[PDB]
């Protein structure tokens, strides 16, 4: 079809930014999980 998602900054939509934000949050959730767990286990 059309690859219009590469013309300067037209490939930055409301839905596109939504998935970018949530994947950051879950990694922080992942990071906070192990960091809390690792500190209680051993250095």
């Amino acid at each position: 079809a059309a690859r219009l998602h590469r013309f300067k900054n037209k490939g930055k939509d409301s839905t596109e930014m939504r998935r970018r934000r949530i994947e950051v949050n879950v990694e922080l959730r992942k990071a906070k999980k192990d960091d809390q767990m690792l500190k209680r286990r051993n250095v």
């Binding site: 900054n9 934000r21 192990d34 690792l38």
Partner: protein, 876 residues
């Protein structure tokens, strides 16, 4: 009444006739499918009927036979095959004789041919179809209409029906289409019909691709067909040639020079739009597949294996004749610039941008003379491409050697941000925006920072099309500053950096631009809000009063949202409201994570009430509440163990969140919320555990939910036991049975989607076992007597990872938690598991590759697993 008149009325301009005809045809098809279709086929087969009626009959049968939604089409296929063979064969007689009796350039019956065969081919009840079509094309006495009608039907056959059902009959069809593809054909319409049908059937022509003589025969046609005087044949042959390149790049080497590359350059010189576009599209795919092959080459190089596929560096040996023409056609812009239509002007940039990435550092000398010479042109046309091509080549070359060019052109860029040409200022905004993201250090230089920064602030007050492009520059500039701030200012959080001097000025300007009435144009509001999210997220310690003021301001913005839920009169208004509510809630996450614990107390009550009412404000539109509850979790992540003040006023909302069973995202976020709740509330979640656990087990039994949510549901079982301790015994028996059942499920290895799906599924299974083992273990004392409840299951748990260790798909995440679980199991019993582990040597090789695993957490769990294994052996 006569059905011929019905076919005329469905095209006549009368609303009442259309619904009456549609109702009668739909009712008759359901009432008597076989007889009515036979009657319809009889009428259309007659050449004496009016062409309008025949077209109407063709589309009506097309609508009944096929649709847009695959599920509706699939059940229609099952309905058709249930019809008796004589009735099915009766319409086959008329349909195969209807073609060639219509003077219309498209064939109405061709769509009908596709629909019937959608169910006939899988059941193979019409085996004489394919041989019949071959004879029609090969017949020299056939008329022009009959030739093209058969070819048109052929294209529909290979476009709608699944490719697997046509794998066997590829040889016969290809023989027919080539016969009608000969350049000796006088009629041009036969050529384009053959060209369109040819490209639709390139996915199962590999059975004919293996023969080099046949392969040379097929390409002999398209190379000669490209030179056809008709413009439609020119693009169609090239368009077919584009798809040929996309698939069979491994064998196009022998003809690229003598036959292929000569046409593409010539086709790219055309003053017509499509001819130059398809040629540009062709060479873009060459670089694109070169990159993917380069990825495969990079994948094989590190592993040491020979590359299964190898490229030939076409892009490097063609940019000499590609850049000058591409740059020349890059200046074909228009005064009435619009972003709605794809045009060769914008098509030029993306192909040039793709070429720069593909050839990496071999595009710098071919473009610098053009930009340096036309950057001072009196007309904006040449200055537009002089700066646009500068940004389009910023990616791919290494930054250090590109520094001398960008540093000297920066003083020109700011002046170019002031010329009266609207397009150049819009173009310059992207270039400075691109240069900030890709070149952090160059974008921040005090000799040019203050003039550049002042231009950016003044720039956003202009037309929205240039305000949108500069907002992302502001956000990237802050991120570039942060990457330079942590190195210089402090180590864990910046205190005061360069942008801090103008930080308080720009942040309120971003608040101002969000209030502009033209925020919808070029997604201005979403651009500013995202820019506002990043600039607040990246601040300095001296900016605490600045972020404090906007925190109050955004709270007042929430107050504005409170009293506007009754202003919905149009659907688009709700859509913007849906977008607006998501942005503010997302912005709440950034500010709540960048404030002081004391400052959070005052805003806790107002936000909690605001979040509570906003959850219930959206009775429908489940998308917005997906962001709501995760925003609520962010409050819990920072507030601490003081959230019990609202727990009694949160259970019905938490309960109904898991009671959806329709949307997987909300419950996927909901299981995160309860995980976040227990992770902070610690042992105060005991009275609330009974309500969620009973409902949570119900989700396990129901299989109507999405497959993706199941591992996350199993993920929350382990952690809740870690908080309460040894009070989970009342639910321990139930979960193990579900854990037993879930671990029993297995699937084959044929489709990579479900192959990697089970990897994360068994990954969730491992961590669930870790939580209950750690939960009953307590805090510091020895093993509790509760460990005997899971004692009989440890053989099964070790057996489950025995199969995982025996597998060869694997995932770095899976191998990590398994090693961590072993340490927990070793702590659980020790000597008891020693006999169990010795009977399973596959876990020994599964832990040795843990050392191979590059992920650090895999290493930490790997050393954790082996250190306790030695202690168990050294226990006695």
């Amino acid at each position: 009444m006569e059905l011929i008149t019905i076919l005329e009325k469905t095209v006549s301009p009368d609303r009442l006739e259309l619904e009456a005809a549609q109702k009668f045809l739909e009712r008759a098809a359901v009432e008597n499918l076989p007889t009515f279709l036979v009657e319809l086929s009889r009428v259309l087969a007659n050449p004496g009927n009016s062409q309008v009626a025949r077209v109407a009959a063709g589309l009506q049968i097309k609508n009944s036979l096929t649709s847009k939604d695959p599920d509706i089409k699939a059940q229609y296929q099952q309905r058709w095959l249930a019809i008796d063979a004589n009735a099915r064969r009766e319409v086959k007689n008329y349909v195969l004789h209807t073609l060639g009796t219509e003077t219309y350039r498209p064939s109405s019956a061709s769509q009908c041919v596709a629909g019937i065969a959608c169910a006939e081919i899988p059941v193979n009840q019409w085996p004489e179809l394919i041989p019949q079509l071959v004879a029609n094309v090969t017949n020299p006495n056939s008329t022009e209409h009959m030739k093209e009608s058969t070819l048109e039907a052929i294209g529909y056959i290979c476009q709608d029906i699944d490719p697997e059902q046509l794998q066997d009959k590829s040889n016969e069809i290809l023989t027919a289409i080539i016969q009608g593809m000969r350049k000796e054909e006088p009629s041009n319409n036969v050529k384009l019909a053959a060209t369109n049908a040819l490209l639709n059937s390139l996915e199962f022509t590999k059975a004919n691709f293996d023969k080099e003589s046949e392969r040379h025969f097929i390409m002999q046609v398209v190379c000669e067909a490209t030179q056809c005087p008709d413009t439609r044949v020119r693009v169609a042959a090239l368009q077919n040639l584009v798809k040929i390149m996309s698939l069979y790049y491994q064998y196009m080497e022998t003809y690229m020079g003598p036959a292929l590359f000569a046409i593409t350059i010539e086709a790219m010189k055309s003053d017509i739009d499509e001819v130059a576009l398809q040629g540009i599209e062709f060479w873009s795919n060459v670089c694109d597949e070169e990159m993917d092959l380069a990825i495969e080459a990079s994948e094989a190089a590190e592993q040491g294996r020979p590359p299964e596929h190898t490229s030939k560096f076409y892009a490097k040996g063609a940019l000499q004749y590609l850049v000058p023409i591409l740059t020349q056609t890059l200046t074909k812009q228009d005064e009435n610039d619009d972003d709605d239509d794809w045009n060769p002007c914008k098509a030029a940039g993306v192909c040039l941008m793709l070429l720069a990435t593909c050839c990496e550092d071999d595009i710098v000398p071919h473009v610098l003379p053009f930009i340096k010479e036309h950057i001072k042109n009196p007309d904006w046309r040449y200055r537009d491409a002089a700066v646009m091509a500068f940004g389009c080549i910023l990616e791919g070359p290494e930054p250090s050697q590109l520094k001398p060019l960008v540093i000297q052109a920066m003083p020109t860029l700011i002046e170019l941000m002031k010329d009266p040409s609207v397009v150049v200022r819009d173009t310059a905004a992207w270039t400075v925006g691109r240069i900030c993201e890709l070149l952090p250090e160059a974008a921040i230089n005090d000799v040019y920072l203050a003039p550049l920064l002042q231009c950016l602030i003044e720039g956003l007050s202009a037309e929205p099309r240039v305000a949108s492009n500069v907002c992302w520059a502001f956000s990237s500039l802050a991120e570039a500053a942060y990457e330079a701030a942590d190195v210089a200012d402090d180590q864990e959080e910046p205190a005061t950096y360069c942008l801090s001097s103008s930080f308080e000025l720009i942040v309120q300007k971003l608040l101002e631009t969000t209030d502009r009435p033209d925020g919808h144009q070029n997604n201005l509001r979403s651009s500013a809000y995202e820019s506002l999210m990043e600039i607040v997220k990246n601040s300095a310690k001296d900016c605490y009063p600045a972020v404090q003021k906007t925190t109050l301001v955004i709270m007042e913005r929430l107050q504005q949202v409170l009293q506007m839920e009754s202003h919905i009169q149009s659907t688009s208004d709700r859509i913007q409201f849906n977008d607006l509510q998501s942005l503010l809630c997302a912005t709440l996450q950034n500010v709540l994570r960048k404030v002081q614990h004391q400052d959070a107390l005052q805003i806790s009550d107002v936000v909690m009430a605001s979040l509570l009412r906003m959850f219930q404000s959206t009775a429908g539109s489940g998308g917005v509440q997906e962001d709501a509850l995760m925003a609520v979790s962010t409050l819990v992540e920072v507030l601490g163990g003081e959230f019990l003040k609202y727990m009694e006023a949160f259970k019905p909302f938490l309960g109904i969140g898991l009671k959806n069973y329709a949307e997987y995202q909300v419950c996927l976020a909901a299981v995160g919320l309860v995980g976040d709740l227990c992770r902070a509330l610690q042992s105060n979640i005991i009275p609330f555990c009974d309500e969620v656990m009973q409902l949570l087990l119900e989700n396990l039994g129901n299989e109507n939910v999405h497959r993706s949510v199941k591992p996350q549901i199993l993920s929350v079982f382990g952690d809740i036991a870690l908080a309460i301790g040894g009070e989970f015994k009342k639910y321990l028996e139930v979960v193990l049975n579900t854990l037993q059942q879930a671990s029993q499920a297995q699937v084959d290895k044929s489709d990579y989607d479900m192959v990697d799906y089970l990897n994360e599924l068994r990954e969730s299974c491992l961590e669930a076992y870790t939580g209950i083992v750690q939960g009953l273990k307590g805090d510091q004392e020895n093993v509790h007597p509760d460990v005997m409840l899971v004692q009989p299951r440890v053989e099964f748990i070790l057996s489950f990872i025995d199969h995982i260790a025996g597998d060869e798909d694997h995932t770095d995440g899976v191998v990590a938690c398994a090693a961590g679980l072993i340490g927990d199991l070793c702590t659980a019993f020790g000597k008891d598991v020693l006999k169990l582990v010795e009977a399973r040597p596959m876990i020994h090789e599964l832990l040795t590759e843990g050392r191979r695993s590059k992920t650090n957490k895999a290493k930490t769990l790997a050393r954790w697993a082996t250190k306790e294994l030695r202690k168990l052996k050294n226990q006695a």
